[PDB]
Amino acid sequence: DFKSGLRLDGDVWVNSIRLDEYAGTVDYQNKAIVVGVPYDYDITRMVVTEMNLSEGAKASIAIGETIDFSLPVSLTVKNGDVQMSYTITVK
Amino acid sequence: RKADLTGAVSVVKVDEIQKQGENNPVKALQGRVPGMNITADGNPSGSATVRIRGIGTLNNNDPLYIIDGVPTKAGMHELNGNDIESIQVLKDAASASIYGSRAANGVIIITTKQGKKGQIKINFDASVSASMYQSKMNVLNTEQYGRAMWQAYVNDGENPNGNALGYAYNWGYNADGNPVLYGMTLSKYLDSKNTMPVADTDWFDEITRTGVIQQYNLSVSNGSEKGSSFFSLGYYKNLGVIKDTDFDRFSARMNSDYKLIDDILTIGQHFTLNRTSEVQAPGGIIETALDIPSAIPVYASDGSWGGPVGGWPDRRNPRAVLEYNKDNRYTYWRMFGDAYVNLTPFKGFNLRSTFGLDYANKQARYFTYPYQEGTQTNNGKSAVEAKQEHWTKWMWNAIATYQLEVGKHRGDVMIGMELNREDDSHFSGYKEDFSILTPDYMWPDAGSGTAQAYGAGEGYSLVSFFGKMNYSYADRYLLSLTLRRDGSSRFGKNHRYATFPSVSLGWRITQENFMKELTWLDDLKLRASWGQTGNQEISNLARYTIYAPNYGTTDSFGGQSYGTAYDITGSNGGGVLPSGFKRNQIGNDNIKWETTTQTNVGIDFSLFKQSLYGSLEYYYKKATDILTEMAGVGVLGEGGSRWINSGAMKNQGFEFNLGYRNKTAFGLTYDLNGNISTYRNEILELPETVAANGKFGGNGVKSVVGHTYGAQVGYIADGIFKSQDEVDNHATQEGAAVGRIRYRDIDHNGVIDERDQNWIYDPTPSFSYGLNIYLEYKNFDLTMFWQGVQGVDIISDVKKKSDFWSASNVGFLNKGTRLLNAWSPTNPNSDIPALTRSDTNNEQRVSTYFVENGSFLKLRNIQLGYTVPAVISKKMRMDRLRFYCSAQNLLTIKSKNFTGEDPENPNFSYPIPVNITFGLNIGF
Amino acid sequence: GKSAVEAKQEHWTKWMWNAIATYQLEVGKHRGDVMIGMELNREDDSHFSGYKEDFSILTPDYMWPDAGSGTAQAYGAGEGYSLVSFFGKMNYSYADRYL
Amino acid sequence: FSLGYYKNLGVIKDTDFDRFSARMNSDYKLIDDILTIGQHFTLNRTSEVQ
Amino acid sequence: DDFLDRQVPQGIVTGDQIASPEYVDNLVISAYAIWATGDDINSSFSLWNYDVRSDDCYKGGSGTEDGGVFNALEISKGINTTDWNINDIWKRLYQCITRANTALQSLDQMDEKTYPLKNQRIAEMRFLRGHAHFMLKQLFKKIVIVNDENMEPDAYNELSNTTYTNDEQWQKIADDFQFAYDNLPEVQIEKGRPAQAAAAAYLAKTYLYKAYRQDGADNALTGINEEDLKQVVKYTDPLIMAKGGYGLETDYSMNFLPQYENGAESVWAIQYSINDGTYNGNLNWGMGLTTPQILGCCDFHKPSQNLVNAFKTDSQGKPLFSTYDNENYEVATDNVDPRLFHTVGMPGFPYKYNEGYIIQKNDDWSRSKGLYGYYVSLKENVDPDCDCLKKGSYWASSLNHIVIRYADVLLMRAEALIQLNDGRITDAISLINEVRSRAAGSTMLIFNYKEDYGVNFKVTPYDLKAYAQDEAMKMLKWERRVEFGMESSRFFDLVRWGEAKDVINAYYVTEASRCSIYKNAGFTENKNEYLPVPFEQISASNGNYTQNFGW
Ligand SMILES: OC[C@H]1O[C@@](CO)(OC[C@H]2O[C@@](CO)(OC[C@H]3O[C@@](CO)(OC[C@H]4O[C@@](CO)(OC[C@H]5O[C@@](CO[C@]6(CO)O[C@H](CO)[C@@H](O)[C@@H]6O)(OC[C@H]6O[C@](O)(CO)[C@@H](O)[C@@H]6O)[C@@H](O)[C@@H]5O)[C@@H](O)[C@@H]4O)[C@@H](O)[C@@H]3O)[C@@H](O)[C@@H]2O)[C@@H](O)[C@@H]1O
Ligand SMILES: OC[C@H]1O[C@@](CO)(OC[C@H]2O[C@@](CO)(OC[C@H]3O[C@@](CO)(OC[C@H]4O[C@](O)(CO)[C@@H](O)[C@@H]4O)[C@@H](O)[C@@H]3O)[C@@H](O)[C@@H]2O)[C@@H](O)[C@@H]1O
Ligand SMILES: [Mg+2]
Ligand SMILES: [Mg+2]
């Protein structure tokens, strides 16, 4: 009788992502994913391989997308009507 | 049977009083007495405010309660109200003067139950009720709050996505360019620590519950020719609709009277013992619940109490506030006793000596648990406050009465001397720095921090010598003359005593022989009365120049403690600082009694063999030399407040009581009791400083002299601006814009300023009425009491936060649901001003916008009962047996001009619930 | 020159509930009384005191903790106990001679 | 119903003890003496300087 | 019949008894303590609430509606004579006057040889009364001079604010300080009591305010009084302060750090104490609203980007007299006066010299979500770990509030010399150079900023040479602005100088670009430079109080 029916109970956590063949470490305090790569590795044409979100969550980037990771990339994970913004940095 | 028989006396039907099933009989008689206003917030206790014949004085206006001859002013919610024989309201100064020196504001005589001669009886009453919250204030949910914020942002022209509250708005423009909101999304956590998830929280439902009321009474009386006695035990419990608030009361009453030596001597006593334990709601809990936005969760991620974080407004969690306040329980003991001795040397002479006692004890322990609700915290402050209060009032009375029945003349002459003494005291200890943080551990001995001690005491004494003379000729002409010499310890020796006369005339027109043929006119009486009464209800230390050593140990909000302690050495404290004295008030040695003159004219009629009875009263009250606390001129500084006799108040009023009782051919007994009253209040004189500061009205802008008490001065809102052309056409004013409130130019100077204010508020109803219907048919009795008030205006503080955005103390607070229907180009058919983030127009100013029609008519009580037939009762060996189901505050009708709800309680005070009660009465 | 005041308050609250069932028989020359009973007792005691110093007028009227201008102390304690009892009694009299 | 007053000034100066007392007892027999309801109450106020 | 006389008042002292000789020291302490306990959050005796009208600072809080009357004062629009804040400040200052007058009345009835310090106590009471009267005169042009201690309460209704003219009222205020200077000891063992040097400095301040005559109905400046200027010079002469042992601190931050309370520069200060036996201590509750949002609430009295740009300096160490406000101060490229890091806490820098609390441009530090900026005042705040800070429903510190500073004395002497223009402009420039040299040396706690955040400190004394009167006045005004920023005197200085209207209008126009609060702001030429006399007081004293010009 009072609830607005916005469906705010969804979860928007990101478990882990893998860029090419390099897994990333996720810190939830600052919403930062850090992916370590070799010094000579080229990060201008990286490929997203997997992205394990929560149940029902949907991210801005899709699996198999080719991204230039020379600078931090913003990501939005949306579940129902809640969202969370992460930043992915490839170092 | 009226005690005075020649004054303004109202007899209250105790059966219909107990039908309502309220803890406080005063609250039960809310609208059953003409010219008597009872205001009750609805808390678990029956505490209520009583105003008889309107406002008659600037100082305390409480009436005088006299229970079994003992005068008192304490509320009746703390006594037992189910052992009352009769209630009589004496509203005339002439009639009520003889009952005490504090009869300026009316007197209520309560006669308790006594053993009837020659019989023994018992009564057991049980009652269980559920109280439900009806006036649930509608507030914005999460989506509505986001929509309102977006609307305010786009109206002001700022970017809504810059709200920085976690709201992301997808929005655009229509064909006409008016912004529209396609959708919204929210961040999951209100903070960067992921500890406060967003949620849709119904704060009112969270802090409210379904209360339970249980009442059990057991009275037993026994009478005889040599004496009588009565003994009653009562228990009451009420859980409030607000959580963690409750009130329970135990009561035990013992009355007896003994007749000795051929009824020459009589010794009687009436004693009652009461114990009330109460937990009260914190101040402004409803306000906090309305203010806190619905996005804040009740509990955090870790299970701790949820609270505002980030940009959310600084409002405490109401649920946590109630949880922490649940332990602040106070216990109150009341010992109300009386012992009288009566001696009759011969037939006409009576000497009565009465000693009354009223001992009150109050013990409380207040806890301050550390709290941390997001950014709201008290830095882990743990403290305890153990408080104790004592009130001791004792009265001694000596009355000598003589009666003569010579010829057709009846003459009663009474003289009396009365002494009253009241002594009050209180003291409290305060301790800090606790560890376990539980009520069991929190004691001052267990404390390990700074300790404080507070304590005070006061009192006063009253002496009275009164005389009364009643003369009746032919049982047709009645004359009454009373004189009173009253003195109080609150005045100096020169002005200690004062004299008050009163005269009353009455004429029974029906006894005259020139209308003996008027058989239908059963009885007709015309009475008049002119009386003077004295008022001295002021502060005990009123004539003294008070200098107090306020060190500064008392808690003060904002730091304006006005303490007296300075680090004159300059070492940042570290010890007992030097102290001194500060002036609290300026003494006045010329203060005397306030004199209230009352003129009453009444007509009592009874027709058709006492089938249609009624009374019509007209009264004029004039209070002069009113003792008022006038403040300082402003340059006089602190302590400039002083008591002075520079007041004048006037009250003209009409009252009309009607009642019709008759039977029906097929066996229906209908009893109708009607009531209607009206009055007008006016202030005639007032001190200049009081008129300037506007404590009694005018808001400090215009003097209230010549206007009703409490009248307010404000602007006049002539709708709202709907176009830039309208804004330009209207007179220039600061902050004028499209969708803003338009203020009328009263003086037509072309500019809106301070001088564009007028009288807009009048807290005087056009008339207050009540109706009681009692239908009896085949062991079924239905009682139905309605109460209505017409022509009353109310200042709505709820409108302040339900019709405006960012018109409160702080921004981003939760608002009412009706805020959504604000004016906009998309919504032209509206009167609510357009939303905005800044109060440029200064809409918080007092204006006619916040004045609403408070007229209402509510079904105060309904009760359907079934009585077991007498033959079955005798077969089962018990007396009168009855079951009943009742509803209190079930239905109400309000004017369409009232945007809020519950016109009786239109503010943030405690809500009034709907009570559904089932009860039984057994007589054995 | 030590001036001080000590305002002390003490409360004792003891309440007892009793339930007794008794039967008497007068058969023949034998008199027999049988009684059973259940009793509950609860006592709760509390006390608290405030202590204030540095007074000036030095009279009972003036000496109150608010009027004090020195070091303040607060003391307070509480305790209590409860008792439950189930008792039975039987009296037999023969010939009004043997009890 | 009983009312009592006692006052004692001790032989040592500035020591005294006074007491007010009020006792009310009653018993009621109902329904052919099948039911009985009784009460015994007392109120005491003692003021002492030791 | 003693029944009506047996009971007597409990725990109080009557008026006839309060005049006893043994309560005189108690009354003195009361009059002192009103200045620490008689102020509210919205009405503080530092007058920071009413200094928001200047260009130094905004008003903090959640938004404009938070303290709407103060927002009206700040924007100089929609100000009503029926303001609760105006009435409150009037009443509180007159309460302080009343306590001082009660102490004076008690003192006047004592024997000289029985009370050897009678003259000293009377001088202290006159000093306090004059201080309150001076503050009232600053806030309101027309005030009631209550300087008769032996005056019945019933006669107060006949008092009027037009009994004396402006010059006469200034003379009446200065008389109290003259008496205090004559009768006070040179050195006081108790730092709370004022000294002869403090009385002389405050008398010099009064005479400086008196010099700028405001004759006529309007509030326009009419001229400069050479006699008043000479009096200022005479009473600010360095010999008096040398006898009193007062001088500039070696560091600027020592004046506001709690560890250096009652320093050399603290000519006189309201003494605030902690854990001294009261409920929460005689803490500075007036500054309670100014604590940053990191402490939980309040967050008022935010400094202004105009003030930061004023602190910004050029490559030669002199303030940018014409291009300071063209661009916002840049930490990496612009030379900055070191006083800025003691006055204003910029984002990205330690809060009150605490590395654990770095100010950030987020909502955790600004309550208004960037509406009032993100700068945080530091002069009235303390370290969060000071132990001098306490939570009494408002975060308040035991830091003393300095009323008179030796820097103020020096700048006042410089102003007197410059306005005289009798050949001592070189001396005025020497005083300004002394203040600037103190500022340059004041880098004991921010020395690491050069290698930590790339902060360039460059401030140099003015060259000693012939200067024109207008140039010297402009340099002095800039020195005052950069020295007493955030200290609640900018608006009063502007009003005294007479350029308040132009300065405030220019500030409104400049800051309307970066702040939407000043969209409708506007300053009236002869109305908004003085608070209106409260309408409640005018109504109470009918036919006696005249409203200020323009209202
Ligand atoms: O203007 C309204 C009326 O006030 C008058 C009286 O003559 O003068 C103003 C009068 O009020 C004082 C209080 O001492 O200052 C108020 C003034 O101060 C301002 C800045 O100018 O804001 C002060 C800051 O304090 C905060 C809290 O940190 O807000 C305080 C605010 O909240 C209150 C009660 O508020 C309500 C009212 O019942 O209760 C709930 C809980 O707040 C709210 O929903 C209601 O608004 O108390 C705060 C709570 O904290 C407690 O200690 C326990 O939790 C309790 O005391 C309260 O429950 C009030 O203190 C106050 O309204 C913060 O939000 C502010 O930034 C400014 O916003 C405010 O106007 C005093 O200085 C001054 O003399 C008249 O003008 C007029 O009649
Ligand atoms: O500070 C006053 C302000 O606070 C309230 C509640 O927070 O009152 C607190 C003080 O009121 C006192 C002093 O009279 O008593 C009132 C409370 O005690 C009760 C106990 O039954 O009433 C006792 C007695 O006082 C009257 O209310 C006044 O005559 C009578 O009606 C009644 O018989 C209880 O009803 C009250 O809550 C004192 O005990 C508290 O410290 C507010 O009431 C007030 O606005
Ligand atoms: Mg007008
Ligand atoms: Mg200090």
Numbering used by the authors:
A (entry chain G): 4 to 94
B (entry chain A): 93 to 1016
C (entry chain I): 472 to 570
D (entry chain I): 323 to 372
E (entry chain B): 2 to 552
What text appears in the publication on this structure?
Glycan uptake across the bacterial outer membrane (OM) of these bacteria is mediated by SusCD protein complexes, comprising a membrane-embedded barrel and a lipoprotein lid, that is thought to open and close to facilitate substrate binding and transport. Here we show that for both the levan and dextran utilisation systems of Bacteroides thetaiotaomicron, the additional OM components assemble on the core SusCD transporter, forming stable glycan utilising machines which we term ‘utilisomes’. Transport-competent FOS are generated from levan by a surface-exposed lipoprotein, a GH32-family levan endo-glycanase (GHlev), while an SGBP (SGBPlev) is thought to recruit levan at the cell surface. Single particle cryogenic electron microscopy (cryoEM) structures in the absence and presence of substrate reveal concerted conformational changes that demonstrate the mechanism of substrate capture, and rationalise the role of each component in the utilisome.
We reasoned that in a utilisome containing a catalytically inactive GHlev (with the active site D42A mutation), and longer FOS chains (~DP 15-25), the binding of a single levan chain by both GHlev and SGBPlev might reduce conformational variability. We therefore collected such a "long-FOS" cryoEM dataset, and observed in 3D classification that a novel conformation was present, in which the C-terminal domain of SGBPlev adopted a ‘docked’ state proximal to both SusDlev and GHlev (ED Fig. 3c.). The unmasked versions of those 29k particles were then used to generate a final reconstruction of the complete utilisome at 3.0 Å with well-resolved density for a complete SGBPlev. SGBPlev is organised into three domains, as predicted by Alphafold. In addition, density is present at two additional sites that are unique to this long FOS structure. Within the inactivated GHlev active site, there is density for ~five β2,6-linked fructose units, and we define this site as FOS3. A secondary or ‘tethering’ site of FOS binding is also observed (FOS4) with density for FOS bridging between SGBPlev and GHlev. The long, bridging levan molecule binds to GHlev across the top of the GHlev β-propeller domain, before proceeding towards its C-terminal β-sandwich domain. Whilst the resolution is in the region of the bridging levan is insufficient for a detailed description of binding such as hydrogen bonds (3.5-4.0 Å), several tryptophan residues are clearly involved, including W297 and W359 from SGBPlev, and W217 from GHlev, which appear to cradle the levan chain via stacking interactions. The utilisome structure suggests why SusCD transporters exist as dimers. The SGBPlev is clearly inherently flexible, and in the dataset with inactive GHlev and long FOS, a novel conformation was observed in which an untethered SGBPlev from one SusClev contacts the tethered SGBPlev associated with the other SusClev (ED Fig. 4e).
